[PDB]
Design a protein around this ligand. Structure first.
Ligand SMILES: *[C@@H]1O[C@H](CO)[C@@H](O)[C@H](O)[C@H]1NC(C)=O
Ligand SMILES: N[C@H]1[C@@H](O)[C@@H](O)[C@@H](O)[C@H]1O
Ligand SMILES: [Zn+2]
Length: 1014
């Protein structure tokens, strides 16, 4: 295993180093506005060395943006695919690349058999080529790597099954900025090449000048280079035709033959395309070939890529003709005019890459090595695209919830083979597909129109219900004596209980367990733990009486705590935000202990008075002018007081101090240690009154943020033996700090209501001497070092926070882990800040045509980990990566993959068992079974189960932490007959494994295995 901490990779281009050196001046470069006047030596190309040009036709089809997926499919995409089928069938040399499998599968299944055969034939012969092959072209900023892999797998599994092809070249022309997580997953999924486009105009200029637009992109920690994936970055401002034939859009626009008028399109540079004829072909070719030769100077080989397309292009038959015919005339002239020394033709993406590598092997070029990312993107001037790191945060949080429910549903149901009547495969496929669709770059990014966002939300809601159905049927089968198990596949044996989604104050959706002497004395609940190690975690349920006690299935008592059910209300009468307690439902909390990838059953039983092993939290409402808060039979009366500073400590955990406004002011790790200053503050960013306005994509603040005026907020303090908390009703945010004995959990119920042109940010102020350095993660997979650059505007220093961020000095680190992707930064030494929601009245001129005014209450969740790191073995100062500690990693897992909770729905569960998985191996803490998926239906004689194993890398900080078992996924199911290492999509076998044993992976590596069972 490579060491991912101690050896700084030696690469030709390291993006953080490049950023430190670059000046980012935005000067007018001439017709290439963001470049310079390119010059070339006409003698470079000659009879023995021609310029091979590949014109690659394409059509960018968004699975939802301005229209929903289905509206685009009906109005545009089905016609584009239908006409592509006809036109390619009829014109053997014409080519076309297709990226979005969600649309392709939708089309293909509607085709009659004769057309399915013609489509397979044009794919088989190479005229229509799939690029990437994922369900969508995902966002690369907010998406979790697990969902990037799920959607890639959903589209490639469909392509292998129906088209018998697996793309090895990727095409990502539209995500707003690019992540090295893509080459990471692709190279482990059989890919050999990838293409990207949206990178900062200054980066395009800088790499173009050194001919470093093509590079072997390796991971920032990869010293050997085995993760490297050849990458081509497009050089210009857009992937449309005006910005893909060469440096001058006024000339390239003349070669988009769809712009002559009848299609309603035109050239903004005021010179229209003209139909190619024998009288103008020499002059038109001379213009086009000169653009091509200028583009060619930016690359190292004699093979040139010329994409030919734009959004939802190649829809009409007349459009196919007008582009194909005019280009065929140009190629016939150019290729027969030796003085151009060019051979041009229609080609596919793979053809371009194969020819580039042939040039490379012939010794004509060597490519530079590069590591780093391409965030934060700016397409022009100071318009940095950091706003979409936060836009539509309710759905960004929903993304993470469904991410987990999909994994849990696939894992719980993988243990058995199911009869087709159970509709398990059906429900799982629907859930994987709706979550995969939302990975689109207008889905999770929050850049779609309002009704499209609603469509993604409905799809995800149906996916969540599908996951629940599968999960609860699976729990019932796993925990019921087999000879008693009598399933009704449409029945709800259990309902899931989720404390954080939609979240208290977002939706009253949780059911109350109703117990009573005259109706039902007890109720079974079951917890599932998707992680491969024993895990304990507090779980809570609503119950109809405070006198409830908990036992495990051996009837051993379990210590429990009951707290009131508090809801916050914006009282329109008193004009205050304050909590009301329920006088009929209460919260019971207890520690559940669950086996690796397993289940554990508990029983809640009512009694007529306080049970022996249940304690009751005290509650203290701090506000001036209080009124009574009765709580029904809750046994402890609520106490009141004027606002004041308070201090809490749960268990042996840290002691946290709060200000009289209910916000954290310090954390004391142990009895003796100092009260380290850590202050939470809420501020607001506004919008500029002149110049460019912030919108769903762009963040253009009118300066640093201003403090939210807090007034004298109501603060609620609940203190319990297992859980305590401090909650405060601030303008737009009920902010809650929850303590259970370790790093606190923070929850914000964010309702920006009608505060127009406002962005609400949560900031942490510490005295940590971080300077200009901070770390943020990429797709929940790795942490990358960031350096605040005062030479760039505030919004350029915002980066995606898909799951965590941290600051540190020689001795102290503060890590903020998130349960949803949001945007954030460290704008001054010792600070961390992360945007909660943004409500923008204006459109930001990128085509959405509306602002963001559809905000809804969202419950954001986090874990805040303050730690001493002076003893940790950290990467040197020059290493571009950072790594979490064991505590920060476990806190991230507590947010993203919590225990699942199930409540038995009927009155009695006959045949109930108390546990599943007690014999599953409890793997080392840095290993995860990211995916467990049965790959075969019940009629397959040989069953197959796939696993994706991911090992993260945690800092060595001196804690011995051993005693774990080797996890061999190939032996998790019995009767194994074969074990293979496969690509991450499970589509290709890479290694037949000895002894049918799946070795564990190295730190920061991910591997996939498939076990076969007789
Ligand atoms: C699928 O593609 C492979 C590779 O070209 C070919 O050999 C095979 O016959 C095709 N159809 C099958 C057998 O699935
Ligand atoms: N090019 C446009 C469409 O393709 C959408 O994805 C927009 O967000 C924009 O990028
Ligand atoms: Zn797009």
């Amino acid at each position: 295993c490579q060491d991912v901490v101690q050896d700084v990779p030696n690469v030709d281009v390291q993006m953080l180093e490049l950023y430190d050196r670059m000046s980012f001046k935005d000067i007018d470069g001439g017709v290439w506005k963001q470049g310079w006047n390119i010059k070339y030596d006409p003698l470079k190309y000659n009879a023995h060395h021609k310029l091979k040009v590949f014109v690659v036709p394409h059509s960018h089809n968004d699975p939802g943006w301005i229209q929903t997926f289905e509206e685009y499919y009906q109005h545009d995409t089905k016609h584009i695919l239908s006409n592509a089928l006809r036109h390619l069938h009829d014109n053997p040399e014409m080519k076309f690349i297709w990226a979005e499998i969600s649309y392709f599968a939708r089309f293909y299944h509607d085709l009659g058999e004769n057309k399915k055969l013609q489509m397979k034939s044009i794919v088989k012969n190479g005229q229509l080529e799939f690029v990437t092959g994922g369900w969508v072209m995902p966002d690369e900023a907010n998406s979790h790597w697990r969902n990037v892999l799920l959607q890639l797998t959903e589209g490639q599994t469909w392509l292998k099954q129906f088209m018998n092809v697996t793309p090895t070249a990727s095409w990502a022309i539209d995500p707003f900025g690019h992540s090295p997580t893509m080459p990471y997953i692709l190279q482990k999924s059989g890919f050999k090449n990838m293409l990207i486009q949206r990178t900062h105009y200054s980066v395009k200029k800088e790499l173009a000048q050194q001919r470093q637009l093509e590079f072997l992109w390796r991971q920032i920690w990869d010293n050997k280079g085995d993760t490297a994936l050849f990458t081509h970055m497009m050089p210009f401002y857009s992937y449309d035709i005006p910005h893909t034939c060469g440096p001058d859009p006024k000339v390239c626009c003349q070669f988009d033959f769809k712009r002559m008028g009848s299609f309603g399109l035109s050239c903004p540079w005021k010179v229209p395309p003209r139909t190619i004829s024998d009288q103008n072909v020499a002059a038109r070719s001379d213009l086009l070939v000169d653009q091509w030769k200028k583009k060619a100077e930016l690359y190292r080989t004699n093979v040139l890529l010329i994409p030919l397309g734009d959004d939802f292009r190649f829809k009409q038959n007349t459009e196919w003709d007008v582009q194909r015919v005019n280009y065929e005339r140009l190629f016939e002239h150019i290729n027969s005019q030796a003085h151009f020394n060019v051979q041009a033709q229609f080609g596919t993406l793979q053809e371009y890459f194969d020819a580039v590598h042939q040039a490379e092997r012939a010794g004509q070029a060597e490519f530079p090595t590069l590591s780093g990312d391409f965030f934060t993107y700016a397409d022009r001037s100071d318009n940095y695209w950091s706003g979409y790191y936060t836009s539509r945060p309710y759905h960004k949080r929903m993304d993470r919830v469904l991410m987990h429910y999909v994994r849990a549903a696939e894992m719980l149901s993988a243990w058995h083979s199911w009869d087709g009547m159970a509709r398990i495969e059906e429900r799982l496929e629907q859930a994987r597909r709706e979550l995969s669709l939302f990975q689109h770059h207008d889905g999770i990014t929050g850049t779609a129109k309002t009704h499209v966002v609603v469509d993604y939300e409905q799809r995800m809601q149906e996916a969540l219900k599908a996951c629940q159905m599968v999960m609860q049927q699976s729990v019932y089968r796993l925990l019921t004596k087999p000879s008693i198990y009598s399933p009704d596949f449409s029945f709800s044996y259990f309902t899931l209980d989720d404390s954080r989604w939609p979240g208290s104050g977002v939706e009253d959706s949780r059911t109350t367990i109703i117990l009573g002497e005259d109706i039902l004395p007890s109720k079974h609940v079951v917890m599932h733990n998707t992680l491969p190690h024993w895990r304990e975690q507090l779980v809570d349920f609503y119950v109809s009486s405070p006198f409830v006690s908990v036992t495990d299935l051996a009837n051993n008592p379990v210590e429990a705590q009951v707290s009131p059910v508090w809801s916050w209300h914006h009282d329109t009468l008193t004009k205050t935000i304050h909590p009301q307690g329920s006088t009929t439902k209460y919260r019971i909390i207890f520690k559940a202990r669950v086996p690796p990838m397993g289940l554990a059953t508990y029983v809640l039983t009512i009694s007529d008075s306080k049970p022996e092993h249940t304690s009751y939290a005290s509650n203290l409402l701090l506000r001036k002018n209080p009124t009574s808060l009765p709580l029904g039979q809750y046994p402890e009366d609520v106490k009141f007081g004027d606002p004041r500073e308070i201090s809490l400590r749960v268990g042996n955990g840290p002691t946290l101090a709060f200000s009289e406004q209910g916000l954290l002011k310090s954390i004391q790790l142990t009895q003796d240690s100092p009260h380290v200053p850590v202050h939470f503050k809420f501020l607001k960013y506004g919008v500029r009154s002149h110049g460019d306005r912030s919108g769903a994509y762009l963040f253009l603040p009118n300066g640093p943020a201003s403090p939210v005026e807090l007034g004298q907020p109501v603060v609620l303090v609940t203190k319990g033996k297992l859980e305590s908390s401090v909650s405060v009703g601030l303008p737009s945010v009920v902010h809650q700090t929850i303590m259970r004995g370790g790093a606190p959990e923070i929850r914000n119920l964010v309702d920006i209501g009608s505060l127009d042109n406002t962005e609400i940010v949560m900031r942490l102020e510490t005295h940590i001497d971080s300077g200009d350095i901070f770390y943020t993660d990429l797709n929940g997979l790795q942490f990358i070092k960031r350096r605040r650059l005062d030479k760039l505007p505030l919004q350029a220093n915002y980066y995606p926070i898909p799951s965590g961020m941290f600051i540190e000095d020689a001795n102290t680190r503060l890590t903020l882990l998130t349960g949803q992707p949001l945007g954030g930064s460290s704008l001054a030494s010792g600070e961390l800040e992360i945007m909660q929601d943004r409500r923008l009245a204006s459109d930001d001129e990128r085509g959405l045509g509306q602002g963001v005014l559809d905000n809804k209450p969202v419950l954001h969740i986090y874990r805040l980990v303050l730690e001493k790191v002076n003893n940790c073995v950290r990467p040197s100062k020059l290493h571009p990566a950072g790594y979490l500690t064991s505590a920060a990693h476990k806190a991230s897992q507590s947010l993203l993959d919590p225990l699942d909770k199930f409540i038995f729905a009927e009155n009695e569960w006959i045949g109930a068992q108390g546990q599943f998985g007690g014999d599953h191996p409890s793997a080392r803490e840095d290993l995860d079974v990211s995916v467990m998926r049965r790959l075969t239906k019940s009629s397959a004689k040989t069953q197959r189960v796939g696993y994706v194993l991911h090992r993260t890398n945690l800092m060595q900080c001196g804690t011995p932490e051993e005693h774990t078992q080797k996890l061999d996924v190939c032996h998790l199911l019995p009767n194994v007959a074969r074990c293979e290492r496969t690509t991450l999509t499970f589509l290709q076998n890479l290694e037949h494994l000895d002894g049918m044993v799946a070795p564990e992976v190295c730190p920061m590596e991910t591997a996939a295995y498939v076990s076969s069972h007789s």
